[model samples]
Target: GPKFPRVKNWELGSITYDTLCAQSQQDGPCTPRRCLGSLVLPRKLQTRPSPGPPPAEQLLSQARDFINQYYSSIKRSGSQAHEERLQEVEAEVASTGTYHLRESELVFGAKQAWRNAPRCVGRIQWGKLQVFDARDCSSAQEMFTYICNHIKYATNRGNLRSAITVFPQRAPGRGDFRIWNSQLVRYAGYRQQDGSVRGDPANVEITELCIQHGWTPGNGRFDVLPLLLQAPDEAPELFVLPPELVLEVPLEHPTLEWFAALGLRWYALPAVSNMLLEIGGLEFSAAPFSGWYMSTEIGTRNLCDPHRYNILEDVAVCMDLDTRTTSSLWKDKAAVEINLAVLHSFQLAKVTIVDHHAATVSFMKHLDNEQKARGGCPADWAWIVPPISGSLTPVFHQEMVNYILSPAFRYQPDPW
Candidate 1:
């Protein structure tokens, strides 16, 4: 016999299986009814332990050693065996097109160099929204809160900033960037097919400004990765940090955990939102991240409010490890890039994290127009073009003025 339980939260209009059953039967009073419960695994049981270290660490350590030796011997010898070996490995990896590496692999390699190399003690820590959960709040509200928290954190954590980055090798012609807003930036040669560089320049600008305000970049107190964009054929165009900054910490880990974390988190939201939760999106049956890999435009639009999903306001952190003395490749390469960038960027004169709160708040003022232009599969499509500039640049066209100014605009559910 099935057991019957009264539904908690006895508010009217509460949709429940019993309510639906009663409505289907068209019964009188729709009295309490028994509903069968489905067994599902709890999150704790479903969660998997972080796998062992990645494979790229060996290659990265060798490269770092060469860099150190190269810099050390620059004035005295002009060239060194280490530098030549580093270039050789870089060229070899470039030919392979695989940069995925994990911490274990690097640790193994590092151990060979020294009997007791410092083991990688990396862990993900959430600063702004440590215990934050987006279950109950509206997406817009959740995003707003996230932005606010990150801004406050970045501002207060002045004198320093760090991140994993992905950038395009070549600067695409004026209109080339209109491609998928979320495409993975590939690093293979001198430059990407598209001419424009891909990555978060805004971070560099902000960090630079912070350093100008009397903050230390990297004091060995913390370690972070800052990804640099490069075409496989050439060296990555490193950000021009002030000369005083330097990376005092030593390379210790190898794995793509850092960067994948960002991608996973980004995909996790869409996964839960579309697959597990089945809220919006035309393809409710598809998994968020899975589908995103196929058709990013359709996938992202289904999850976010098309044009409303502004990358500028969003905060993303990812890491990776390289074991093979090879330069980083996407996905697995995030750890190396992020770690190197942090260590190196801090060496600059003045670098600081950007305050995204103010930027996001100000960007919201044009929400209406952005929404109006945000209907199609790829909202970013209409946002970046020369033909229909009006349709693309909603904020510039005064279209969002009225809606943003409206009283109803208070972090409410915005359906695009």
Candidate 2:
């Protein structure tokens, strides 16, 4: 006797397991539909409105405020040049209904977005970010070049640097330029024969899309996926990353030599490519940004999520801990040890990695500094709190406020 169970919400779709009966078992090889359940329609897509450019008056006002804050932050006295620039912005807006920001203004906006990012606790280093102005990139090839350069520069040969490379702004009646890759660097996932997946499950759809678009998929677990780039009104293009450009750190524990035997590794830089960058109401849909890693993100969520690597059980068994019962807190203990290994490995490799405790304490300092400087700071508690140990960190004790702010980074719809 065989059993069949219905599984719901399996990556935006439902799956059913079916058992073959005596009458249905005539074929030499069982078909997928016979073995598995019949296919159901995919869930409805959750789409968001593409943000339009701000009103002319609103753009002008934001420009003026930013100029004032820029001068104050730099301790530079407001001179006639500052006033003249403000007037120019106002005049341009009045005449053209929108004004282009100066290079310095773009830099200021990028830094402010980093500072105003509710989920990012790395705002203390926002001032040192490298801003790449790629507004002139009008084709997918050019976007690929800019992304490759960004990956190389941010990777920094193991010393990651925070950066944002912004593409053109959205325009009326035209498609937006977009980077289809979730991150500049990610591993491809392939569904296996035994109802399992290899590599990163979160990237299965994109990986299959890349393969369909003429990419040669690799067999290794850490193979970097190709970037599916799209320009306005153009077909998407696939570009494979150079092996030397992406820096990866092999995972190992500080004292457990066998930890390295598990054959785990992660990319050094976690550059997000799908988010939209908004400055003064102008939306840059293809703006990809990067920040240094917080250990919990990689060691906990990426490695331990059920839909992800799901490595908790293996780690628990390796540690000789009780895995038969959740009451023993085996998952929590394994997660903490995994996080410790991530932090320890990165420190030993001299890479920039922050622990949950130190990162949260620094975030509190960032909050204090922002309060004195900007009167308020926005933070998302769910995102700000570490995954492994929530209440153990200082951020878990502090109250946080989440709100929309100008020069913010927002999650946009996936460009399928």
Candidate 3:
């Protein structure tokens, strides 16, 4: 009945008008007729024309708005420094046709991007993120050094901390700095002659690229893939992660002694390495950001997805379940146990991890805080809900609005 989107919680029988969705400057895939909210991935975007320099006026305008936002956030709006900062941005754009964020601005933008990420349910910890400026890094070796340091800090021996290291922004005249792997730590996938994958099917293409670039390949299922670090206009270089630096939790169950026999392990750091960091109008082509995991991301989606490890049948067989029919709910039963093992193993190892129940409960509080503070929170419900027990989570019943916000960590085409 209201003019704005009305969000309802089916479980609680409460309703709220999403006045904040009105603040969205852009539209999402949903329209008046249909909602694409349930789709797991974004549809193919209408390709833009090849990038030349963007129009100068548009860049200037975006910069102006961003500077205003930064100033307003610090309660410095309309002060001499705020006006001067805006003027300084304009001056930079006028003289050099581009602008840069200051150290504090970079840190602010990184945290804002994480907060604005529609898919992340852990936005409650947005304020505590560490931002590392690797903007001065000009070579692949230097990028490797910066990344290793980020790993060392964020991993913190499995008492994980959230952090992002931003390399140089993409320039109009040069190729972009890029991280070829999807995540900082991932297992190698070897394609067999019979056409099956040995480790993570997700990394097979990246693994091939690594081998093609003078790095030796490994045969094990859990071999940590090396970084394909690239500086501007340079071929991607391979750097193997130090074994001691990569902290991994070996999976084990509480009561099922045989569960650990499968030898499954996941890295403690969930550092996503390939997303582009955009703030105001500039793009950092190689910004890697990370946080600790929610157990379902590892135990359910990564380990049990048919396209990934596909461990459900194996676990079900061991559990002596009737996998002969979907009626037995063998997959469902096995999935819960797998998730429990993930939680138990991390707890046993003293590694930082949140289970689905605890994580979603916190997210509900985040939703409430955002509603009171910002009138709305941008969320992509499909990705936000845990894969295994989607309906069981509070987020499932709470309708959310999806939209884009600036200072965003965005997906970019891979550097082949």
Off by over 4 Å in 1: 1-121, 124-129, 159-344, 347-416
The sequence of per-residue lDDT tens digits that candidate 3 reaches over residues 256-367 is: 9999999998989999987888788888878999999999999999999999999999999999999999999999999999999999999999999999888999999998
TM-score of each: 0.17, 0.82, 0.96
- Those runs of model 2 whose alpha carbons end farther than 4 Å from true positions after fitting are 1-83, 94-97
Predicted structure 1: clash tally:
60
lDDT of 1 by residue, 346-381 (tens): 223233321122222234332222234322011111
Model 2 residue 5 lDDT score? 29
Steric clash count of candidate 2: 0
Residue 124 Cα positional deviation in candidate 3, in Å, after optimal superposition:
0.6
lDDT of 2 by residue, 11-107 (tens): 2353322221211101222255662111121121111544554577766776676667666656774887777877887887788666777788789
In TM-score terms, candidate 1 sits at 0.17
**lDDT (Cα, 0-100) at 409 in candidate 2:** 73
Q: After best superposition, candidate 1 residue 182: deviation in angstroms?
A: 8.1
lDDT: the better of candidates 1 and 3: 3
lDDT of each: 0.23, 0.79, 0.87
